[PDB]
Amino acid sequence: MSFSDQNLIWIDLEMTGLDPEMHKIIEMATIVTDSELNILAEGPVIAIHQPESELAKMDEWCTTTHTASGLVARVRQSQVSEEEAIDQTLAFLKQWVPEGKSPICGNSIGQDRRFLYKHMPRLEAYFHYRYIDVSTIKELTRRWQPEVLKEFSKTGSHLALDDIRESIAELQFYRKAVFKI
Pairing relationship of beta strands 8-15 and 25-33 according to DSSP bridges? antiparallel
Is position 129 annotated as part of the catalytic site?
yes
CB of 1 to Na ion, least distance (A): 28
CB of 9 to Na ion, least distance (A): 15
| CA 13 to the chain's CA centroid | 5
Ranges within 9-28 binding Na ion (CB under 5 A): 12
Task: Return the axis-axis angle of helices 134-144 and 160-177, rounded to nearest 10°.
Answer: 50
| Residue 111, C-beta contacts closer than 8 angstroms, at least 6 positions apart | 18
Neighbours of 129 (CB within 10 A): 8
Distance in angstroms between the alpha carbons of the first and the last residue of the chain: 27
Catalytic residue among 117, 126, 129, 131: 129
Which span sits near Na ion by CB under 5 A: 6-14, 30-38, 56-64, 92-100? 6-14
The residue (of 12 and 170) whose beta carbon lies closer to Na ion is 12
- Count of residues in contact with Na ion, rule CB under 5 A: 1
CB of 144 to Na ion, least distance (A): 24
Question: Could you list the active site residues?
Answer: 129
Chain residues in the site for Na ion (CB under 5 A): 12
